Design a protein around this ligand. Structure first.
Ligand SMILES: Cc1cc2nc3c(=O)[nH]c(=O)nc-3n(C[C@H](O)[C@H](O)[C@H](O)COP(=O)(O)O)c2cc1C
Ligand SMILES: Cc1cc2nc3c(=O)[nH]c(=O)nc-3n(C[C@H](O)[C@H](O)[C@H](O)COP(=O)(O)O)c2cc1C
Lengths: 123, 125
């Protein structure tokens, strides 16, 4: 009895993260193979860490503030932001984050897509 | 009311169109379509649920593409392919289609899952 939705996420070519805001600092509790190929990290290097580690010297603080404020308000956000592979290579990340609420309205998870749009935006 | 499945919410909330089909029902019908798929194609959930994904094909669709998909599905193998499909509006578009079979622990086919993406502009160069 395999979960078809889990397999959807495991097999898609679109990078995806799930985080758990009931653990301290809202850490990644799942990253799909697409995310690990994109960024160069192993699963054990990203699980248990906040997604912040993708940010670096080029990252616009205005982008980071907007994400922080949407997460605190438990609201979704779409935004392009400069992020960094483990190698150190910069890329433009088209980032989509959505909160996941209980039936009772209690925040449970966050889920995200990430898409390298370096070539698109280079135009 | 149970804790909500994070992976189901991942697929419901992503902007990437996705379908799940059930090959143990007759004609391998769609049993889940995410809102991204309904935005892409223009259909309501009740117009696509319970149907084979074939309904997206039309006069422009290359039968060679359809044969290749049919043969991959019968062999329970994945396929990546661009194919002409049709929105409910009638507009034709290039669909970058990614299909994967989903196996049991025992290796028995259980579901198929797909991504779909309008790549009309990319392919138009
Ligand atoms: C599910 C999820 C995925 C995230 N993915 C990214 C990401 O791909 N890149 C990034 O720069 N920040 C990402 N973030 C944002 C950071 O984790 C963090 O929330 C951001 O830096 C704002 O907060 P801070 O000031 O506490 O670091 C993600 C956040 C969540 C909830
Ligand atoms: C999970 C899944 C998703 C599919 N999505 C599409 C789609 O978006 N577009 C399409 O043209 N065919 C799609 N198909 C392929 C058709 O449903 C069908 O298998 C194909 O037309 C070949 O078989 P046929 O000769 O019976 O029509 C999908 C099939 C599966 C299993």
């Amino acid at each position: 009895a395999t979960d078809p939705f889990r397999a959807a996420v495991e097999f898609t070519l679109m990078p995806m993260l799930i985080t758990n805001p009931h653990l301290p600092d809202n850490p990644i509790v799942f990253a799909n193979p697409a995310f690990l190929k994109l960024t160069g990290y192993e699963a054990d290097e990203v699980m248990g860490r906040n997604s912040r580690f993708l940010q670096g010297h080029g990252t616009d603080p205005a982008h980071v503030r907007a994400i922080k404020s949407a997460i605190a308000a438990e609201k979704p956000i779409d935004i392009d932001i400069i992020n960094y592979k483990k190698s150190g290579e910069a890329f433009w990340n088209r980032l989509h984050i959505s909160p996941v609420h209980n039936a009772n309205g209690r925040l449970q998870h966050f889920v995200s897509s990430q898409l390298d749009v370096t070539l698109e935006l280079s135009r």
